[PDB]
Amino acid sequence: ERDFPHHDRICIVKTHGTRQEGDKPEELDFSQVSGGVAPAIQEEIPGVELATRTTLYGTSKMILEDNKTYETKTLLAEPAFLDMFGVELIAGVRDSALRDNMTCLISESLARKMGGDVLGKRLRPAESKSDRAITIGGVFEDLPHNSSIQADMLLPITWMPAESLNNWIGNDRYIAYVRLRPGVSPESLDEALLEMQKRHQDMEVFRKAGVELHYSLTPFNRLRLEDPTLVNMLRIQ
Amino acid sequence: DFPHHDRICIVKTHGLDFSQVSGGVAPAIQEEIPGVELATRTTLYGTSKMILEDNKTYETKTLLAEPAFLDMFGVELIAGVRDSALRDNMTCLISESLARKMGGDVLGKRLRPAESKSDRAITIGGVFEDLPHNSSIQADMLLPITWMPAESLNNWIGNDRYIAYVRLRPGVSPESLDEALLEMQKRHQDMEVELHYSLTPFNRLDPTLVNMLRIQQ
């Protein structure tokens, strides 16, 4: 399995801090962030080559062309996801990818399960009573296995409400990936991150809840092994 | 805060829990359930571009609503006739902020969906005072819920794109109504996962894939 491009230089944004009505003080440790953070980092923080955001929808059922039903794991992503993770399309137009809200990308395995030749076909949620549908605009090479980044289907992040995308308080449902330029240590950026946080985040809301937190970059280790049961393991020997 | 905000609930579904319902629920609740002062329904259209008098284009968050929406949420009309509001499918109400953005004096002007090749138009029948900022309820433009087809509106199964708001009478607990709701459900939907209606207090302060898909442009 491939390494991601420049993998030695990819970090994720973590959040650390403390909270506090009868209950003892809590140390806060998050691996996900509010929507607003990733774009701001790319714009504002020196030494950042690229930043991008994802949010996992999860697994749900999709019906293809009004017939067969497929369980699909859906991830919401930016066009930059393709660059950040070196994702190549087997079919469809790369420039187009993940720009139109009514279109999706499907993994090579999923396309195969669907019977192949899926480009241009239409998908909708299994329980939908509408003829509105999502069009398959591309097919992407399966993402590396035994990795934290997992998706059967990719949809544009713009599906999310503008309020979420621009949020700095709570709703920490996004993973923010940051690629640094060579020679930049993640730790060096703590102060700038703070400056950025102060610019965008109303701090009042936190003090009211007795919360202090801050962001820091940590190197990204993708490894997440598939649950190693005999049943799982046997299937791939 | 909305009027009697302490007594406002929304309809949730329980089996798995959801805060939206099929089109038919709200009217039935008002009709058949004792302890209920008022009930109304809305569905979010989404954000789209509207063209004003064949000139400038404005991005507009659009919400479909009933006239009772004005009562339930205490919405004052800055301009136009309240009694007329949201009666006619071919008219809309516009927020003060949008009206201002639009250069003002917008009463009677005509709007068309940008991407539309027809010349049919919606007319601005009123301007409403901006809704509270902190709320889950947001709209630049209000359109009559009767834009939706009968098949949607009267439906009890699926297509749960509606938010149903209920104002209880004083001294009635939400919990108290679970039984009457169940009776209501049996009458309206043949029951043949288990799903049931319940009321939870509305807190003006998590999208499903179907929900998101519906409002995408």
Q: Which SS3 state, helix, strand or coil, does residue A163 take?
A: helix
Q: Which of B135, B10, B143 is nearest to A163 (CA)?
A: B135
Amino acid, res. A228: P
Q: Which of A233, A221, A77 is nearest to A144 (CA)?
A: A221
Distance CA(B39)–CA(B37), nearest Å, equals: 7
Contact flag A128-B210 (C-beta cutoff 8 Å) = yes
Residue B61 near residue B142 (C-beta atoms within 8 A): no
- Which tokens hold the place of A111? 């396309």
Distance CA(A167)–CA(A162), nearest Å, equals: 8
- Which tokens hold the place of A231? 């049943």
Residue found under tokens 């630049």: B140
Q: Which of B43, B65, B21, B18 is nearest to B207 (CA)?
A: B18
Which of the 8 DSSP states describes residue B120? Answer: -
Contact flag A125-B207 (C-beta cutoff 8 Å) = no
- Bridge-partner residues for B163, per DSSP? B42
- Bridge-partner residues for B79, per DSSP? B127
Residue A90 near residue A110 (C-beta atoms within 8 A): no
Contact flag A134-B209 (C-beta cutoff 8 Å) = no
Residues in chain B: 217
DSSP string, B20-79: -B-TTHHHHHHHH-TTEEEEEEEEEEEEEEEEETTS-EEEEEEEEE-THHHHHTTPPEEE
**Tally of CB atoms within 10 A around A27:** 8
Q: Which SS3 state, helix, strand or coil, does residue B94 take?
A: strand
List CB contacts (< 8 A) between B212 and chain A: 159-160
Q: Which SS3 state, helix, strand or coil, does residue B156 take?
A: coil
Q: Which SS3 state, helix, strand or coil, does residue A64 take?
A: strand
Contact flag A101-B207 (C-beta cutoff 8 Å) = no
| Biggest CA pair distance of chain B | 55
| Interruptions in chain A after residues (C–N over 2.5 Å) | 20
- Which tokens hold the place of B170? 């004083």
Contact flag A159-B212 (C-beta cutoff 8 Å) = yes
Distance CA(A84)–CA(A104), nearest Å, equals: 18
List CB contacts (< 8 A) between B159 and chain A: 129-130
Q: Which SS3 state, helix, strand or coil, does residue A193 take?
A: helix
User: In this complex, is the C-beta atom of A161 within 8 Å of any C-beta atom belonging to chain B?
Assistant: yes
User: In this complex, is the C-beta atom of B195 within 8 Å of any C-beta atom belonging to chain A?
Assistant: no
Residues in chain A: 237
Residue B71 near residue B83 (C-beta atoms within 8 A): no
Q: How far is CA B20 from CA A61, B11, B56, B118, B210, in A?
A: 19, 7, 35, 33, 11
Distance CA(B46)–CA(B143), nearest Å, equals: 12
Residue B48 near residue B217 (C-beta atoms within 8 A): yes
Distance CA(A91)–CA(A139), nearest Å, equals: 5
Which of the 8 DSSP states describes residue A168? Answer: -
Residue B159 near residue B23 (C-beta atoms within 8 A): yes
* Residue ranges per structural domain of chain B: 1-217
List CB contacts (< 8 A) between A156 and chain B: none
Please, which residues have CB within 8 angstroms of residue B87's CB and are 6 or more apart in sequence? B67, B144
DSSP string, B51-66: EETTS-EEEEEEEEE-
Residue A39 near residue A166 (C-beta atoms within 8 A): no
Q: Which SS3 state, helix, strand or coil, does residue A188 take?
A: helix
- Which tokens hold the place of A23? 């209950």
Distance CA(B43)–CA(B21), nearest Å, equals: 10
Q: Which of A47, A140, A45, A38 is nearest to A89 (CA)?
A: A140
- Bridge-partner residues for B58, per DSSP? B50
Contact flag A60-B209 (C-beta cutoff 8 Å) = yes
List CB contacts (< 8 A) between A129 and chain B: 155, 158-159
User: In this complex, is the C-beta atom of B216 within 8 Å of any C-beta atom belonging to chain A?
Assistant: yes
Task: Name the experimental technique.
Answer: X-ray
Between A and B, how many CB-CB pairs are < 8 A? 30
Contact flag A125-B158 (C-beta cutoff 8 Å) = no
List CB contacts (< 8 A) between B214 and chain A: 130, 132
| Structure-derived torsion over alpha carbons of residues B99, B101, B103, B104, reported in degrees to the nearest 10 | 20
Contact flag B216-A101 (C-beta cutoff 8 Å) = yes
Which of the 8 DSSP states describes residue B148? Answer: S
**Tally of CB atoms within 10 A around A158:** 16
Distance CA(B152)–CA(B160), nearest Å, equals: 9
Contact flag B216-A60 (C-beta cutoff 8 Å) = no
Distance CA(A199)–CA(A216), nearest Å, equals: 16
Residue found under tokens 């087997």: A90
Distance CA(A112)–CA(B15), nearest Å, equals: 34
Which of the 8 DSSP states describes residue B81? Answer: -
Which residue in B158, B214, B217 is closest to A127 by CB distance? B158
List CB contacts (< 8 A) between A174 and chain B: none
Contact flag B210-A74 (C-beta cutoff 8 Å) = no
Interface of A with B in 34-73 (CB under 8 A): 57, 60
CA neighbours closer than 13 Å in the CB half-sphere of residue A162 = 9
Q: How far is CA A206 from CA A22, A162, A191, B102, B213, in A?
A: 18, 22, 20, 37, 33
Cα-flanking dihedrals φ and ψ of residue B65, to 5°? -150, 165
- Bridge-partner residues for A178, per DSSP? A11, A51
Distance CA(A34)–CA(A56), nearest Å, equals: 13
- Which tokens hold the place of A41? 């980092």
Q: What angle do CA B103, B107, B110 make, to 5 degrees?
A: 85
